[PDB]
Amino acid sequence: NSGTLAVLVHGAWHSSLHWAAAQRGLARRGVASIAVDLPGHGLDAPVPSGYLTAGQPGLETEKSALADITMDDLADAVVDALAEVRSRFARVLLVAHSAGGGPASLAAEKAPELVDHLVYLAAFVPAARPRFTDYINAPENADVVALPIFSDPANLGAHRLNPLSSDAIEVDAIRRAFLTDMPPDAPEGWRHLLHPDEPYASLSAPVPVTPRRWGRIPRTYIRLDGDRALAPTTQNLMIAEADRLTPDNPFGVRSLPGDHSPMVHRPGELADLLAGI
Amino acid sequence: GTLAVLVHGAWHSSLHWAAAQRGLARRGVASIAVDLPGHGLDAPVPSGYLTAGQPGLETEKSALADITMDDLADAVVDALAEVRSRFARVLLVAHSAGGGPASLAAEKAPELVDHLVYLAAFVPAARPRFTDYINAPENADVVALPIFSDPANLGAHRLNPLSSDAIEVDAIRRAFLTDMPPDAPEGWRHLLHPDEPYASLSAPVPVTPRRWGRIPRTYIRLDGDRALAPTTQNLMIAEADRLTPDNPFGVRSLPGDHSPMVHRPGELADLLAGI
């Protein structure tokens, strides 16, 4: 693991900060790691003009500043990060979580030489269906906790969530979807560490990958069996459908118990898993 | 085989190092960022912090009231102990109030640090409390932070970047992010934490010249700092060097504001990689 680097790509509404504890776990095994902040996430992220204002005026109608972000912009940010570290490490592992699988996969398609192994952590695999919504709305995913995404995401230019809502039922839906295994008396800092706007392209734009570029990279899926945001059945569906398109290079399959956020609630064993890939 | 362990400052978290971490990887320097107790995803919020009008924010006792300076330092030691056998060279980089816990951690376990970097950070060698330097005459020129009154009774030094008073919010911006472009996004406002543990700025940090004082160390002064005066940074350097005449500070510099890992992450990473 002396020359292995894990490039971590966060999921929708999250950022690089959610990987922090898992990065500590990886270092404990001598695995260096960096976390990419996709456009619209991290310290650079915007918020709607009323998101931090009492009453939250205009939140349901204001157009998002992320409306013009394309799927290629998200992938090219991953390509840029992979390109900056390629000459420094012999083995580069691309680790994507949830919606990050789109941009990570397209980056591996654009530049397969920059990626030595793909790791999908309950993430979107665009091999068989190019849009994440193609799986989110599939019958296998009907039993997940329905996220309170704002109506008409195409017009806002983003899939909008409101963890700062005064509606405790609304906030509790986000809580149960992402952080199901959270202790009953846990701190509430996570509420203002999420970003409200996820670019429309992230969940709704097609991600075209081919079996002769993306499909030849060694890859592993990590299924989260207690996932209430993306059903384990949907995760198995993505593994089976993608494998049928690359029969000579099938998915490696690992498994963890618990909710959609093992980097938060199981960072130690997630790092141990990643170091074993 | 070099690992940089990054300790954030007050009201911040590991998140703010992200751009500098990517810059360090460019140069082949691995890095992790520690989240001190009460920061990051572990951070609590007052019950009214996210409520319209923020009721009770001025009086509610903090959940961080019982965190001691030893708790903050022991978290740094625990992080340093996990990576010691995996890297030949461990750089402990502290920013601002992070210098307190990082220095006490280095004093508790000197074999876990090969070099200390103080990035406009508190150096407790000559004065054990950060307020000994914050309230020094050399620091009178900083942008006054709108910290809530009576931090001892609250159990925290409280900041309110979510305040409806634009002047209050702008004072936080002018102190930490003076060089912010004119039309920058607002995300930074909700990525700060309101409560900094009372011990962070007020508790004494005891280090000795034969433990902490023997570790190679560097200070990175920020010349356009409006949160911690550059004069205060030079004073900390000089006063600390008198107590360790055999091991004086290495002194480097960066222009710009108090947040170089936000506004100058490239040159900051070039500096750290060259240490």
Author numbering:
A (entry chain A): 6 to 282
B (entry chain B): 8 to 282
Excerpt from the publication:
Here we report that three evolutionarily-distinct BioH isoenzymes (BioH1 to BioH3) are programmed in biotin synthesis of Mycobacterium smegmatis. The BioC-aided methylation enables the resultant malonyl-ACP (CoA) methyl ester to undergo two reiterations of FAS II cycles, generating methyl pimeloyl-ACP thioester that is subsequently hydrolyzed by the promiscuous esterase BioH to give pimeloyl-ACP (pim-ACP or C7-ACP), a precursor for biotin synthesis. The enzymatic activity in vitro combined with biotin bioassay in vivo reveals that BioH2 and BioH3 are capable of removing methyl moiety from pimeloyl-ACP methyl ester to give pimeloyl-ACP, a cognate precursor for biotin synthesis. As a member of the α/β-hydrolase (i.e., esterase) family, they adopt an identical pattern of domain organization, i.e., N-terminal lid domain connected with a core domain at C-terminus.
The crystals of BioH3 were grown using the sitting-drop vapor diffusion method and diffracted up to 2.27-Å resolution. The crystal belongs to the P21 space group, and contains six protein molecules per asymmetric unit (ASU). The two BioH3 monomers contact each other via two interfaces (Interface I & Interface II), giving a 2-fold axis-centering dimeric architecture. The fact that total buried surface area of the two interfaces is over 1760 Å2 underlined the stable existence of BioH3 dimer. First, its core domain is of α/β-fold in nature, comprising of six parallel β-strands (β1–4 and β7–8), five α-helices (α1–3 and α10–11) and a short α9 turn. In contrast to its core domain, the lid domain of BioH3 is pretty unique. Apart from α-helices, the lid domain of BioH3 also contains two β-strands (β5–6) and several connecting linkers. However, crystal structure of BioH3 illustrated that only two predicted residues (S103 and H265) are localized in the catalytic triad. Instead of D248 predicted by sequence alignment, the residue D232 participates in the formation of catalytic triad. Similar to the Shigella BioH with known complex structure, the PEG-loading cavity of BioH3 are mainly formed by the side chains of hydrophobic residues (e.g., W18, F137, and F183) from its core domain.
